[PDB]
Design an enzyme around this catalytic site. Structure first.
Site, mmCIF file in Angstrom:
data_model
loop_
_atom_site.group_PDB
_atom_site.id
_atom_site.type_symbol
_atom_site.label_atom_id
_atom_site.label_comp_id
_atom_site.label_asym_id
_atom_site.label_seq_id
_atom_site.Cartn_x
_atom_site.Cartn_y
_atom_site.Cartn_z
ATOM 1 N N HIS A 276 46.306 58.023 16.644
ATOM 2 C CA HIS A 276 45.049 58.784 16.573
ATOM 3 C C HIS A 276 45.014 60.101 17.307
ATOM 4 C CE1 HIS A 276 40.770 57.355 15.382
ATOM 5 N NE2 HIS A 276 41.061 58.538 14.860
ATOM 6 N N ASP B 295 36.355 52.848 14.577
ATOM 7 C CA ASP B 295 37.287 52.603 15.688
ATOM 8 C C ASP B 295 36.676 51.554 16.613
ATOM 9 O OD1 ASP B 295 39.233 52.898 17.833
ATOM 10 O OD2 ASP B 295 39.582 54.970 17.237
ATOM 11 N N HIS C 171 37.390 51.796 19.640
ATOM 12 C CA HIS C 171 37.446 52.656 20.838
ATOM 13 C C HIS C 171 36.780 54.004 20.607
ATOM 14 C CE1 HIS C 171 41.022 49.985 20.575
ATOM 15 N NE2 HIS C 171 40.603 49.690 21.798
ATOM 16 N N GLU D 127 46.886 54.633 12.952
ATOM 17 C CA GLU D 127 47.331 53.590 13.863
ATOM 18 C C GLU D 127 47.934 52.385 13.149
ATOM 19 O OE1 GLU D 127 47.683 53.863 17.008
ATOM 20 O OE2 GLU D 127 46.384 55.493 17.696
ATOM 21 N N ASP E 230 40.553 54.579 12.335
ATOM 22 C CA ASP E 230 41.484 53.836 13.198
ATOM 23 C C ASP E 230 41.473 52.420 12.652
ATOM 24 O OD1 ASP E 230 42.843 52.390 15.106
ATOM 25 O OD2 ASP E 230 41.974 53.438 16.867
ATOM 26 N N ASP F 227 37.759 56.826 22.076
ATOM 27 C CA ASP F 227 38.848 57.769 22.149
ATOM 28 C C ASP F 227 38.373 59.107 22.717
ATOM 29 O OD1 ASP F 227 40.349 55.846 21.063
ATOM 30 O OD2 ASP F 227 40.854 56.906 19.179
ATOM 31 N N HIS G 47 46.352 59.317 22.539
ATOM 32 C CA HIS G 47 45.589 58.754 21.416
ATOM 33 C C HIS G 47 44.244 58.206 21.868
ATOM 34 C CE1 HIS G 47 46.675 54.098 21.370
ATOM 35 N NE2 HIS G 47 46.567 54.502 22.618
ATOM 36 N N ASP H 263 42.297 49.801 13.869
ATOM 37 C CA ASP H 263 41.910 48.769 14.828
ATOM 38 C C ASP H 263 40.384 48.666 14.905
ATOM 39 O OD1 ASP H 263 42.769 50.660 17.904
ATOM 40 O OD2 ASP H 263 40.864 50.592 16.871
HETATM 41 MN MN LIG Z 1 41.547 55.415 17.850
HETATM 42 MN MN LIG Z 2 41.108 52.182 18.409
#
Ligand SMILES: [Mn+2]
Ligand SMILES: [Mn+2]
Ligand SMILES: [Mn+2]
Ligand SMILES: [Mn+2]
Ligand SMILES: [Mn+2]
Ligand SMILES: [Mn+2]
Lengths: 314, 314, 314
Positions: C96, C119, C121, C272, C227, C123, C136, C229
């Protein structure tokens, strides 16, 4: 928030052994440490020692009643103390029979409490409607004022005084309710969100109406009794009585995040984690990890994130 | 509720063999017994015997048409009978091609019926839009009055008379629809809740608008045709045409609980359970168990619990 | 819709190696072909070649900054070009960190863009709040005009000019946010739907308020940085930083179907995917397949079905 941890390594409210190890595997997972890494003030009141009661034959169908009775009596005394110390009781189970003493001791100090019962089961059989005799399927029946008159004098429970009325409790997650239990439910007009209602409304609306229902007349201490079998077994498999189609990981965290945000959580039960029953080591950690997560959410851990009242841009 | 069970061990509406074993593995699972343990009046009309039709070459692209045609003709006759006996037909499949005869015979007795089609697929290809030729992907096209004129005379279906109009059916669970099918959908203005709509509104609102849509002008018999591939394969893997991102276990029980509560269920199809295609014995039981659960919900089993009109406090 | 594919085989925004293989396993999966089988006009701008920068010691805590910096600079140039060619940029990652250049080059051509950041997260760590140093976990901090003044001059990012304000971005899927990040979130008033909000409102309402929030004043180009994840690891396990309790397969397709339908998607990041980290070959294909599905949904693939403006009854 400020917490009083109580280990309750007891299993005789049901037949399968390793539930007594719950407080051990939870502590092993760093529950206390993670609580402290949060905004938490944590005091450990140890693991209650539950001396053997070797002479304990069934009462009618009812199994291990003196043992279940004394363990709840013991725990009730210990819960009232931490409540008197100004702390939220955290009961690490152990089988759900302990809730008799947990909610009993809580209400000694806060009789106005309301109860949120997260569980696939209503656990409201009486010693006359139970088929199995396992006392972990009866705690609510002992606590309800309205069922006074239908609960025979069982050895080991003479100390009990019903402390909660039908309108003071809410159920969430129900999906395996006996007929007598369902009768009691409708008959006493107990408030419940079964999996059907969760499916219908969404866990958002469920919590909204749960909290409104219990807190609406006015603010009150909340008791959360959390049976990890309320959550789907894909999340909490190492547990005695799993039932498919449960609450998700997310719904479980939603429930406890919302309960945390009331600022009224006063007592918590984390029940029925049985490491012996995972079919793999990973099933055991999956269960324990989930149970820690749910616990941390009760005390302020938020998925959106958390920060202290300092300036982080420095 | 009162039921007429019909086994339909037929597979030639599609290529993979073991679908014909569905009525066997469902009965093996104690479906009949569990129905009776409920509030249910149950009569078994046996497994239809579907004599071989060895001379059955394709019609154009269309595979096994005489065989599919006669099996549906046979079943239609049998469904009309149980409907005449005042019973809800329970068709244990078998591949979904059978729905031609199930809905055909149902409507012989109740022409005003409405259909709920739970499925990842619309199963509305015509013999001219199908690419595969498998008749389990065409039943709806044969039943729709509006597609009269676009359905060639296929050997074995001369007995068919379209019995349902576009506005009389609702789809739920769609996620693998062909282009010609989508064209038909938009063109005939058929009502559908694809997985997108289920995601958007919630299965609660979906059922609300489904039932309102079909029952709003006035009350009518309901036909539920349930393709177990409508549910995610993590729930019903032993099935011929699985598609990921399906309806959950909970959503599947929600659908049928709500259909039960209308009191209008008159016919039910339980289709596409193929034990040969589970990659493990556990995949097979997982599928069968799910299919039994869905079936029991159609006939009153409720996750909140069930009790008889007696006093259980005694 | 019309697309400009850019492979970005880069990994040094984080420690684990195989993320650089994402564009390979995605292309291998037939992404380009499946795009074309759709309504899509597709031009491949190749895999950027990211020459080694062997002398690249940490800047403070910040790891591989020259490498991350140049890769984003390179990509930004390439994104602006496809945007100038009238095409939606499709960046195949890669870690990312690349989003710095993706959103940077996009906005060169369309400064009014709005960003949807899917995401687990945020980030948004800065080089001063990051604990790990992995870039990232910092791209958003480099892009935000409001954090200008808090972002030290890091070698390799001198070319950067913050191109988006706090009110121009929405987060969806958050469930592992650092304290400094959460501070930034509340402090800059950034709009987010964490998993809690998704649980509360439903992904339907989330997208409704996301799109209204960003598009309400007026229509604008949308940048979707995805992302993988963000989705639960049961869907996208082969990824560096998985967090349980994520967005479902269905919710992920819902998001992108709704973004597609705005007609405003102008830039897309698919980030990712790390095939080296699946613990099985099936984990790898499960991830890749999910990532292709999400991608196809961005460009018009609909679960209800798709058809061309021709008459299919012929
Ligand atoms: Mn990310
Ligand atoms: Mn993430
Ligand atoms: Mn339980
Ligand atoms: Mn329980
Ligand atoms: Mn199907
Ligand atoms: Mn079907």
């Amino acid at each position: 928030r400020t917490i009083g941890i109580i280990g309750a390594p007891f299993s005789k409210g049901q037949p399968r052994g390793g539930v007594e190890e719950g407080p051990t595997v939870l502590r092993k997972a760093g529950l206390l440490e993670k609580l402290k890494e949060q905004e938490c003030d944590v005091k450990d009141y140890g693991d209650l020692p539950f001396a053997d009661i070797p002479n304990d034959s069934p009462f009618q169908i009812v199994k291990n009643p003196r043992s279940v009775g004394k363990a709840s009596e013991q725990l009730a005394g210990k819960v009232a103390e931490v409540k008197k110390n100004g702390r939220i009781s955290l009961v690490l189970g152990g089988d759900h029979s302990l809730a008799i003493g947990s909610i009993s001791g809580h209400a000694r100090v806060h009789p106005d409490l309301g109860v949120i019962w997260v569980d696939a089961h209503t656990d409201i059989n009486t010693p006359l409607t139970t088929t199995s005799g396992n006392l972990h399927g009866q705690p609510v029946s002992f606590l309800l004022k309205e069922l006074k008159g239908k609960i025979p004098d069982v050895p080991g429970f003479s100390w009990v005084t019903p402390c909660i009325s039908a309108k003071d409790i809410v159920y969430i997650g129900l999906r395996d309710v006996d007929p007598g239990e369902h009768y009691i439910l409708k008959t006493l007009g107990i408030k419940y969100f079964s999996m059907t209602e969760v499916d219908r409304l969404g866990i958002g609306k469920v919590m909204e109406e749960t909290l409104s229902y219990l807190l609406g007349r006015k603010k009150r201490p909340i008791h959360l009794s959390f049976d990890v079998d309320g959550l789907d077994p894909s999340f909490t498999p190492a547990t005695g009585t799993p039932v498919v189609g449960g609450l998700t990981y997310r719904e479980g965290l939603y429930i406890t995040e919302e309960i945390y945000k009331t600022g009224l959580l006063s007592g918590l039960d984390i029940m029925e984690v049985n490491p012996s029953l995972g079919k793999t080591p990973e099933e055991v950690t999956r269960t324990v990890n989930t149970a820690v997560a749910i616990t941390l959410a009760c005390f302020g851990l938020a998925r959106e994130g958390n920060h202290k009242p300092i300036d982080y841009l420095n």
